[PDB]
């Protein structure tokens with residue numbers, strides 16, 4: 299029993315973190331095989347970030363200008379290239395700690411773990427979700443750029459995020475491991491505002507199923523609803539519209555608890571309309587939306 | 603910016619997890635140097651757990667009955683001993699991945715990370731606090747026993763908790779790495795109820811300082827209070843009494859924000875008396891008490 303915001307074990311990713319310095323800018327890099335992946339703004343001075351022309355800035359850079367340090371040992375850079383908003387630094391040594399890995403571009407609503415790093419050294423690990431407005435609500439200070447987001451399937455690490463920026467509103471933006479930003483964000487020190495941060499409806503329902511499995515059942519009511527009726531309520535409360543695909547993915551949780559998905563939708567509907575009334579669900583006074591149905595199943599079964 | 607429930611990077615502890623089987627009971631062990639630490643109830647059948655005499659049960663056990671597996675390789679057990687509620691299995695091979703470590707018995711209010719494991723394999727990592735009633739609110743399924751709680755200082759892992767039991771109320775009890783239970787709990791399948799779960803006042807104040815540092819300031823009021831007046835309010839709301847030691851530890855946060863500790867106590871006092879009124883602080887609708895003043899400073903500075 300017990301339900302926690304759990305991150306994947308970080309060891310496999312800790313063994314990939316390196317420090318990358320270019321001129322006077324230092325950030326984190328991800329060392330996989332003989333390549334180090336890092337944000338391309340490593341080549342910028344804070345002054346260049348106001349309006350950078352990365353291709354032009356990169357012309358003035360040679361392999362020897364990119365200092366890559368893994369622990370206290372220096373890696374030799376033998377090639378460099380820009381792929382979208384990331385730099386790929388070919389080093390002469392393959393990372394002996396390279397795990398089995400994939401690069402995946404996740405969809406909003408999907409969750410992942412972040413290994414926050416400073417100077418190639420890990421500080422902590424926490425669980426995030428790609429918000430529907432393509433930002434993440436992380437915890438990143440200066441020096442954290444290049445810290446990565448990932449998921450793990452048995453022994454394979456699927457890297458999904460690389461940290462690049464903090465918007466003026468304290469929220470975070472970044473790319474997948476191909477250098478493509480999630481959302482409309484650009485690696486530039488300019489006014490970039492996020493869109494509406496809607497609640498990930500499928501995740502709240504999954505978390506309500508986790509609450510039932512763990513004993514919290516006060517919110518279960520005698521009602522049911524339809525997808526269209528539920529969605530009218532979800533629109534009013536800035537919740538993502540629920541689709542039949544979302545219903546299908548909640549199937550195993552519905553089967554385990556014996557509570558039909560549309561009945562849980564009705565419970566969620568009353569929670570939105572009436573509030574918690576000072577009560578809690580899994581030690582939270584708000585509806586948690588950063589557990590996918592897959593995360594609930596994983597945590598409630600014991601997948602390692 | 604951004605403030606998250608962050609766990610320490612788990613790699614150093616992942617390299618210590620092993621599986622321990624005795625008869626038909628399998629749980630997790632912690633392999634440090636040439637010793638494997640595990641709950642002594644590994645020698646029990648679920649039937650023995652109703653009323654075990656561990657010394658008597660242990661007489662029927664030899665070194666060869668304790669099967670220790672690290673990954674897919676078997677460790678040879680050359681000695682075994684019972685220290686309080688833990689078994690120490692001397693193996694013939696020192697763990698090559700042993701980090702620098704200490705065994706510490708933490709006080710209630712202190713936080714730590716848990717690497718939840720199943721069959722010697724890590725599933726996830728999350729941040730806990732030793733509650734004032736000596737329980738932890740974890741996430742543990744059958745097979746999770748022997749999973750450990752720890753803190754990290756640069757390269758030294760201070761192991762503080764080993765998971766042993768789930769009380770009938772869904773809360774968790776366990777020992778330090780010397781086998782001494784936190785609280786009055788015993789490793790027996792019997793009715794054990796927890797005491798009052800009070801709120802860790804010093805941690806809530808530290809979290810309010812983290813909120814101010816990260817932009818959430820609506821709860822700051824024009825009032826102040828005294829330790830005695832604040833404590834009258836804290837008693838009513840089942841909050842731990844605040845001492846001058848707690849005030850001293852909040853000193854760096856007070857210095858950084860320019861908000862005197864007693865002024866923050868007055869803000870907390872009004873939050874207790876009036877509630878949040880539907881508002882949030884660091885994305886929470888309740889007062890978080892699982893960040894120590896040390897955790898707030900660590901996260902807000904970038905300690906690796």
Ligand SMILES: *[C@]1(O)C(=O)Nc2c(C(=O)OC)cc(Br)cc21
Pocket residue numbers: 324325326337339340344347439440441442443444462463464486487
């Ligand atoms: C990341 O590269 C990082 O590590 N720091 C940083 C800053 C910074 O330090 O600003 C003063 C700014 C940006 Br746009 C990105 C990053």
Ligand SMILES: *[C@]1(O)C(=O)Nc2c(C(=O)OC)cc(Br)cc21
Pocket residue numbers: 628629630641643644648651743744745746747748766767768790791
């Ligand atoms: C831990 O040793 C564990 O891993 N499982 C377990 C059980 C259990 O499986 O009960 C059916 C019970 C206890 Br008291 C402790 C533990």
